[PDB]
Nucleic acid binder design. Structure first.
Ligand SMILES: [Mg+2]
Ligand SMILES: [Mg+2]
Ligand SMILES: [Mg+2]
Ligand SMILES: [Mg+2]
Ligand SMILES: [Mg+2]
Ligand SMILES: [Mg+2]
Ligand SMILES: [Mg+2]
Lengths: 107, 80, 145, 141, 67, 206, 70, 63, 141
RNA sequence: AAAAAUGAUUAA
RNA sequence: UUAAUUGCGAUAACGAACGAGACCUUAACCUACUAAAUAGUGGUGCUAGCAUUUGCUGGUUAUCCACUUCUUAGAGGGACUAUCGGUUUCAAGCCGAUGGAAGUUUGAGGCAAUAACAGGUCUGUGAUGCCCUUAGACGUUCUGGGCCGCACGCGCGCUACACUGACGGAGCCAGCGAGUCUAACCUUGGCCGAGAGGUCUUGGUAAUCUUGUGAAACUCCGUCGUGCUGGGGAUAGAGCAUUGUAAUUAUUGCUCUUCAACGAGGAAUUCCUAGUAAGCGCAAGUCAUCAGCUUGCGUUGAUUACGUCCCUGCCCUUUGUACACAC
């Protein structure tokens, strides 16, 4: 509270690569702009969600299967900053379809 | 209360919205205007709006018990 | 690697539990010819009978054959854990038995007759000759059942 | 620091990373000596880079190999490819490269997979069959 | 087969028409020049266009070509 | 000669393999020299392999399998009849054992015995089905060297497999005796008598 | 067919007589030439190698390869 | 058995109903001017040696 | 001169340690031996009725030495195998949990393994010592 | 130049 | 000539469009970039455990430094048949070799035109016209039963007929996933039990834990010994548990016992050209319980052929037709 570091961590998850990468780049830019030393955006392996279904609504015809996929892209950045700036960064740099989580790491 | 908020904003270039065109044609059909007239009016509106191409398919029973499909097109239309 | 040399004392086809137990076959797999004793039961009976497991059923002597028979008759009195047995907690008297050569078929007849006499579904299925464990009868078991 | 290089060898899905630094002739796989690589019918497949170039120039060098993924055969091939690529890599970095060229010629004149990972890859299964090409049995009438 | 379709053929021919002096016998610099003497939505198509352009150049060098 | 001291103790019997390439570190490809002409450039005994198991691509071209070593081609032909599909380790071990047995029965190079069997078992004349009528006939044709070596390998492995089926004798031993008999020609070996039947039928339909 | 699984004196003198001069010594050849079962063949083969009158070439399970001594 | 050897110098084409036979033009090794056309079962390249039981026929199914 | 149990072959090392344990009398057989079939996947009891427990103990001690810590469930999965299910296809079935637990406790009483505050059983002081001794004599047999 | 027959009514 | 109405071209056509291609996803290459206790390696720097003139390991970013080869994912590069040699209406192209990670459109898919079929679905739909029914209902619930019923015929399959094997010990290796706090999901570890399972706890809303899913085939050492045998495990009897209100018509799992056909299968017939066939298991879907099914995944990994129009068919052109419900 008295201008001390909180050991913060931010997680970015989205189905949109471009929007998510824009958010991550913006947060990085505000990081070294306010002169922050940090662990850069670590990219988790992309999660592919699959559902395989018979195309036919009935059960007639050649048995043709069809696989739909969602792609979940996640990144995390470990930051250390005072309250007046962690709030400032959190209230900006948000896009639709990109979910942001902020946690206080104590390890 | 207050964590859900709901705005409404105008659709620009509404002639390029397939959902809006399909709804408008549907209501024209409910009002009873001719199927060929309504389809071609939709196609002309879409093309006048600046679309590269338009395509309207009307399937079902038309004036007869046996069902058929009428097809209206203008401009260019890719498929694959 | 003991190349033991034997005289004409090899016991050929012999009789245990009213059955013909032939030589030239290890004692464990030779006792399996007796009804009601399989590979696991025979191996347990043999190791509790303290007999070597490479005796071809022919160089077994009289007293150890008798000991094997006695252990087969009375598994419980030689520390066999009673979940290893053929008949545990029977309908008649509730003590753990083990049916042997001539009595497996007799007891099977008796229990099937019990089911028939009480007119239970599995018993009447046995009487009709159909399958009793809920198998489908549309396509399988046709030629003989 | 000690002069070292790190390389890898890749079969279908097995990868073997090899550390190659100056030593006394120490060749180990998963902390165990190269002489104990299993299966022993294919243990010579791992021996091949030794037996071709020669153990003479393995005196100054030692290799430590860690291999994961794949199966037994695939791991063996990953180990042999990683050993050869580590040898050529250390000779490139800390030795004159005419010797590297004899190593390259010796390995490639015998088998292409001493330096180059096999490009064969699994073909995904398609519906309507147990495999990538094979289909379910068809019936008429 | 490796028959090049009309899009590659016509784009290469147009490049020959417009930038014959600038273009060179080798694929590497022809491909690099294509980045700015043309706008292609895909690197694969750009490589195909440059490959046919340099093929036509290597044929033009040893005698003319019709069309 | 002159073993070199090493931090990892590497045995002398594999130190000696550093001299020249030896199949299973016991037999050499030197002095083989397939004698029946018309089969050279097709029976690969030139490039020496330490073991009959490599993951070589010999199926993406037409004639590329001619460069695969003939020992490995026989080993590949051992993996057959479904239950043995794959299991190239078992096939290689069988080949090693059968070569040991071959050298035991004959003080002679097992690779030479194998190539002699293949040469003596390659069918030189076969027939092809022709004629569209109800009773199709057979027309006699010649055989290419590649098909000759392919059919020789197939016949040898099939005869070994069938003689191994349902008997005490081991697949390695029956492959050994089949190769021994075919390396000389005795009409008691499966591949030799099958080739004789094919050639006699080709004569009949000449 | 039958094979003797017990070794009596006659079958032992015969095996000690004619196992030498065998070009190839293994379980299969022992069973085929002498009416001995596979297990008896295996133990007899081990006894013979123990006493050193046959020398092995390759020692492998399910495939034992032996030849004449010296 | 007077088995002869011939060297293929030209591949002519593919014959047979199923196309399983190949027509080749082969000279002889002892005499390099005794060329005959033959029908072969398996795959054939150029410069291959065939062993012929019989050495006088002419292969049919031309053109 | 220095060596651990990584420079000796697994099978003959396990035979050596099992024979050692057998000769010595510190390791205790549980008593339900002579009855159990050591896996639901199996169908016959071990063919070595007098030494299978000692062999399993040597195998477990070596496996624990190789790893950081290993527990009963992992031993069960390791020693379990495919089970024939009649006219149904095979599937992996775990080994005897009671047997793995008793053999681990017996190794604890003899002192080869210990509590392992990560949660399993790891290699101990005298266990590492005498296991290395057995490796040493197995090399200089 | 082997053999190869048949296919109910109405229903644009 | 091309896989291609792909092009070279010819030309009463010219100039266009859709489809093909292009495109997108995925799979391979990158010691190039950007970096990472949610991935690793080294320095063992830190203590260290075990053997010893140095090796294997433990706890290793809140004990610590580095550094991205391997792992991950962003931006990119890379192949365009490059070069060379041949052949061609020498044009489109094609065939060899050399380089290269990659030269059948590099592999595999996704997407995919016009016209149509009385093709299937009214039992997916609060999509639906018409007809019927609507209070003793064809509406809706509840109990029980059936859908599984067996003289029989057929189609997908599973397990086998054994020694290239079964059994026992030991060795000991993947990849794709999924997972609970609106309630009991994946479960480590300890203890008990032959087993199946039970109990006490822990971690995991997950590159963090289950999990290195230590899978199976496989490998090595032993028992067997050509005998329907220790191959095969159908049928059946007894008991012990789990899911569920509910297990009988046996849910499934486990233990003992019984131990049938089957010794390679007539006519006939299916699938497939390289990491492919085949063997082998694993995860997911359905799921309280139930895989012999499917969708994917990896492990082991052949033989044969790079062809033809003989059979079965497909495309274009020409030709005949008494066919157009179209042989
Ligand atoms: Mg296992
Ligand atoms: Mg009801
Ligand atoms: Mg049904
Ligand atoms: Mg993994
Ligand atoms: Mg059910
Ligand atoms: Mg399931
Ligand atoms: Mg189903």
């Amino acid at each position: 509270q008295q201008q001390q570091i909180i050991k913060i961590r931010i997680t970015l998850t989205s189905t949109k690569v471009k929007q998510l990468e824009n958010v991550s780049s913006n947060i990085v830019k505000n990081a070294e702009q306010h002169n922050l030393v940090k662990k850069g955006p670590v990219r988790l392996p992309t999660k592919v969600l699959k559902i395989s279904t018979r195309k036919t609504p009935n059960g007639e015809g050649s048995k043709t299967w069809e696989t739909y996929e969602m792609r979940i892209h996640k990144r995390y950045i470990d930051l250390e900053a005072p309250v007046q700036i962690v709030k400032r960064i959190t209230q900006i740099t948000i896009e639709p379809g990109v979910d942001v989580e902020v946690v206080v790491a104590s390890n | 209360p207050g964590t859900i908020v709901l705005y409404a904003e105008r659709v620009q270039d509404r002639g390029l919205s397939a959902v809006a065109q399909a709804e408008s044609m549907k209501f024209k059909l409910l009002n009873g205007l001719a199927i060929r007239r309504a389809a071609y009016g939709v196609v002309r509106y879409v093309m006048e709006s600046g679309a590269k191409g338009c395509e309207v398919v009307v399937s079902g029973k038309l004036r007869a018990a046996r069902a058929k499909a009428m097809k209206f097109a203008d401009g260019f239309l890719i498929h694959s | 690697s003991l190349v033991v040399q034997e005289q004409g004392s090899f016991q050929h086809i012999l009789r245990l539990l009213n059955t013909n137990v032939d030589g030239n076959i290890k004692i464990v797999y030779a006792l399996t010819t007796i009804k009601g004793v399989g590979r696991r039961y025979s191996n347990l009976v043999c190791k509790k009978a303290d007999v070597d497991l490479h005796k071809r059923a022919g160089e077994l002597t009289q007293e150890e054959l008798e000991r094997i028979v006695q252990i087969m008759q009375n598994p419980t009195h030689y520390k066999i854990p009673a979940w290893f047995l053929n008949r545990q907690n029977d309908i008649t008297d509730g003590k753990d038995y083990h049916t042997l050569a001539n009595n497996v078929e007799s007891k099977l007849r008796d229990d099937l007759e019990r089911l028939k006499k009480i007119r239970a579904h599995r018993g009447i299925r046995h009487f009709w000759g159909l399958r009793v464990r809920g198998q489908h009868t549309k396509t399988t078991g046709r030629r003989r059942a | 620091a000690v002069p070292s290089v790190q390389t890898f060898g890749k079969k279908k899905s097995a990868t073997a990373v090899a550390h190659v630094k100056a030593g006394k002739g120490l060749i180990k796989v998963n902390g165990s000596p190269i002489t104990l690589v299993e299966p022993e019918i294919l243990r010579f497949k791992v021996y091949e880079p030794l037996l071709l170039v020669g153990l003479d120039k393995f005196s100054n060098i030692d290799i430590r190999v860690r291999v994961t993924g794949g199966g037994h055969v695939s791991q063996v091939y990953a180990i042999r490819q990683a050993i050869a690529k580590g040898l050529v890599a250390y000779h490139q970095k800390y030795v004159d490269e005419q010797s590297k060229n004899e190593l390259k010629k010796a390995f490639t004149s015998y088998d292409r997979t001493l330096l180059i990972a096999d490009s064969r890859r699994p073909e995904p299964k398609k519906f309507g069959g147990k495999g990538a090409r094979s289909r379910f049995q068809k019936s008429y009438r | 087969g490796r028959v090049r379709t009309k899009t590659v053929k016509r784009a290469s021919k147009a490049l020959i028409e417009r930038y014959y002096p600038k273009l060179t016998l080798d694929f590497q610099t022809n491909k690099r020049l294509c980045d700015e003497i043309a706008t292609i939505q895909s690197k694969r198509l750009r490589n195909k266009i440059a490959g046919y352009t340099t093929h036509l150049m290597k044929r033009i060098q040893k005698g003319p070509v019709r069309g | 000669f002159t073993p070199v001291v090493l931090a990892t103790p590497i045995p002398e019997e594999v130190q000696q393999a550093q001299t020249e390439i030896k199949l299973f570190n016991k037999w050499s490809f030197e002095e083989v020299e397939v004698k029946d002409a018309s089969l050279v450039d097709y029976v690969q005994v030139r490039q020496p392999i330490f073991v009959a198991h490599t993951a070589g691509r010999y199926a993406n071209k037409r004639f590329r399998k001619a460069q695969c070593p003939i020992i490995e081609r026989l080993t590949n032909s051992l993996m057959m009849n479904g239950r043995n599909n794959g299991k190239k380790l078992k096939a290689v071990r069988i080949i090693k054992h059968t070569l040991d047995i071959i050298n035991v029965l004959t003080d002679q190079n097992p690779i030479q015995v194998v190539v002699d069997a293949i040469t003596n078992t390659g069918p030189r004349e076969d027939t092809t089905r022709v004629g569209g009528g109800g009773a199709a006939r057979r027309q006699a044709v010649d055989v290419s060297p590649l098909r000759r070596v392919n059919q020789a390998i197939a016949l040898l492995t099939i005869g070994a497999r069938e003689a191994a089926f349902r008997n005490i004798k081991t697949i390695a031993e029956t492959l050994a005796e089949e190769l021994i008999n075919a390396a000389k020609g005795s009409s008691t070996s499966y591949a030799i008598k099958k080739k004789d039947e094919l050639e006699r039928v080709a004569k009949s339909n000449r | 067919a039958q094979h003797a699984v017990i070794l009596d004196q006659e079958k032992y003198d015969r095996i000690l007589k004619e196992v030498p001069t065998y070009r190839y010594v293994s379980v299969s050849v022992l069973v085929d030439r002498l009416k001995i079962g596979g297990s008896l063949a295996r133990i007899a083969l081990r006894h013979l190698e123990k006493e050193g009158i046959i020398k092995p070439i390759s020692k492998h399970s399910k495939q034992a390869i032996y030849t004449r001594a010296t | 058995t007077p088995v002869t050897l011939a060297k293929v110098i030209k591949v002519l084409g593919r014959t047979g109903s199923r196309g399983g036979v190949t027509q080749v033009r082969v000279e002889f090794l002892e005499d390099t001017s005794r060329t005959i056309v033959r029908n072969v079962k398996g795959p054939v390249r150029e410069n291959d040696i065939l062993v012929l039981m019989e050495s006088e026929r002419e292969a049919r199914r031309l053109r | 001169p220095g060596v651990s149990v990584r420079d000796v072959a697994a099978q003959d090392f396990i035979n050596a340690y099992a024979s050692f344990l057998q000769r010595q009398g510190k390791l205790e057989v549980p008593g339900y031996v002579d009855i159990v079939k050591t896996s639901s996947g199996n169908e016959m009891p071990p063919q070595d009725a007098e030494g299978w427990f000692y062999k399993r103990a040597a195998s477990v001690a070596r496996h624990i030495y190789m790893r950081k810590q290993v527990g009963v469930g992992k031993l069960n999965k390791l020693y379990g195998g495919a089970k024939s299910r009649g006219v149904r296809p095979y599937k992996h079935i775990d080994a005897s949990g009671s047997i793995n637990r008793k053999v681990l406790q017996a190794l604890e009483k003899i002192g080869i393994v210990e509590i392992s505050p990560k949660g399993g059983r790891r290699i101990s002081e005298n266990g590492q010592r005498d296991l290395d001794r057995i490796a040493a004599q197995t090399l200089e047999e």
